[PDB]
Amino acid sequence: CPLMVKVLDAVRGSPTINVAVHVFRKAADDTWEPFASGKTSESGELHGLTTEEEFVEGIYKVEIDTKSYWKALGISPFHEHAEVVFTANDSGPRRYTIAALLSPYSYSTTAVVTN
Amino acid sequence: CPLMVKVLDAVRGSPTINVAVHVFRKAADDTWEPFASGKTSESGELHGLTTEEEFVEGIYKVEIDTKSYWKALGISPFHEHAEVVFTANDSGPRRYTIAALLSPYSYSTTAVVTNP
Amino acid sequence: CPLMVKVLDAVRGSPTINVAVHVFRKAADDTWEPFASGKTSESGELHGLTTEEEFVEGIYKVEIDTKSYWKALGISPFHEHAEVVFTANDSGPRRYTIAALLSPYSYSTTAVVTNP
Amino acid sequence: CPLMVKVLDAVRGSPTINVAVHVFRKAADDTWEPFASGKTSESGELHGLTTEEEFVEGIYKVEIDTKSYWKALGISPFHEHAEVVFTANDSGPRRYTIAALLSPYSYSTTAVVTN
């Protein structure tokens, strides 16, 4: 499992359940080609997006549908979505965890990168 | 002054000087069209991007060039940039401050919105 | 003005008005002795806590009353307060801004330090 | 396991290894009585601090020795430590995870509270 996403709710103090996540890779013509997708579990985590064989060097984008989450809770949000863009595997393969912390008018995202 | 951007360095505890910022608006055909650009000053702030007349209701994108900032200091960071996307002025005119706080493997962003 | 405090609400995207702030210094016998206090203004800022003369080298503590802010809006938050502890002026006089960003189950804090 | 602590490094993109953590409970005379302590693992996590029987209602403090961590890495820090103070179990027992994200001049702390 070379890529995993984990999401938390700063208002309720809970994992974010059933939020949509889309992944893209950048093409030779500089457009974004769809690659993988899913929804977060009851623990706020999304596993099984790609394999070591498929996840080659390149530029990748992760898009989290934050607006649909806050609408479902009846709270008014600021952003359309939350986005992370990064270069992968420049020094060999690694395992990547993308962590996001969510509030209606503010978010943070951190990468935890291992061996 | 209806749109302002402010950037800080969380390693040194200081404002971030000469950082590039580009702004786009969503067109009727779903394309991103160039709206404004500039660089941060000594206080880490960028003023005078637009006017109340020009800044109509729509979806806007603010892209901050965080990779060039880190590379100039000898560091290879995680992110390519920091990007913020939002609907503006849908309940009438407002003033917007977009703030960003930077680390090599993390960033946070916050919006302060006031009624002029 | 060598010490300033600024507070924001991350649910509403707005400055936080009338929030209580207390400051203490560590005494030679290891006790905390009261140094200054005040409340935030309409812009969420608190100015004029001390002077360059009075603000000597030492360990300082800033306590922000976040529980009362949330309770006044009908909310029962996680934290009792937000507290920041730091050594000041150990390489000569500097200006300090202490910023805090508030959610019911989370807070972040940042220091901006400049050479006057 | 009613209480666990997890810590991350925003400069290196890694868990924080071997950082000291102390826990206190507030006494009738308003002083802080020492309760439990330990160090974070290779995954940045600290388990086994207390039990359901011992962890009764009250006000608790968690202190993380952030200054010693940054000194060991040769980077100059702002804060003496990072502190979280909270009331526990007011509506019955819960499981509490205290998560902290660390930079030299800035930190955040979030609570994840379950059933």
Curated annotation (Swiss-Prot), chains A, D:
A GO CC annotation recorded here is: azurophil granule lumen
Indicate the impact reported for residue 107 to S: In AMYLD1; amyloid polyneuropathy
Location in the cell reads: Secreted; Cytoplasm
Documented effect of changing residue 46 to P? In AMYLD1; amyloid polyneuropathy
After translation, how is this protein modified? Answer: Not glycosylated under normal conditions. Following unfolding, caused for example by variant AMYLD1 'Gly-38', the cryptic Asn-89 site is exposed and glycosylated by STT3B-containing OST complex, leading to its degradation by the ER-associated degradation (ERAD) pathway.
Give the recorded effect for residue 100 to T: In DTTRH; increased affinity for thyroxine
Residues listed as glycosylation sites in the UniProt record: 89
Record key words, sorted: Amyloid, Amyloidosis, Cytoplasm, Disease variant, Gamma-carboxyglutamic acid, Glycoprotein, Hormone, Neuropathy, Phosphoprotein, Secreted, Signal, Sulfation, Thyroid hormone, Transport
Effect caused by changing residue 80 to K: In AMYLD1; amyloid polyneuropathy
What does altering residue 26 to N do?
In AMYLD1; amyloid polyneuropathy
Summarizing the annotation, the consequence of altering residue 24 to V is: In AMYLD1; amyloid polyneuropathy
Q: What else is known?
A: Tetramer dissociation and partial unfolding leads to the formation of aggregates and amyloid fibrils. Small molecules that occupy at least one of the thyroid hormone binding sites stabilize the tetramer, and thereby stabilize the native state and protect against misfolding and the formation of amyloid fibrils.
Q: Which family does it belong to?
A: Belongs to the transthyretin family.
What's the name of the protein? Transthyretin
Its organism's taxonomic lineage begins at: Eukaryota, Metazoa, Chordata, Craniata, Vertebrata
Q: Which gene encodes it?
A: TTR
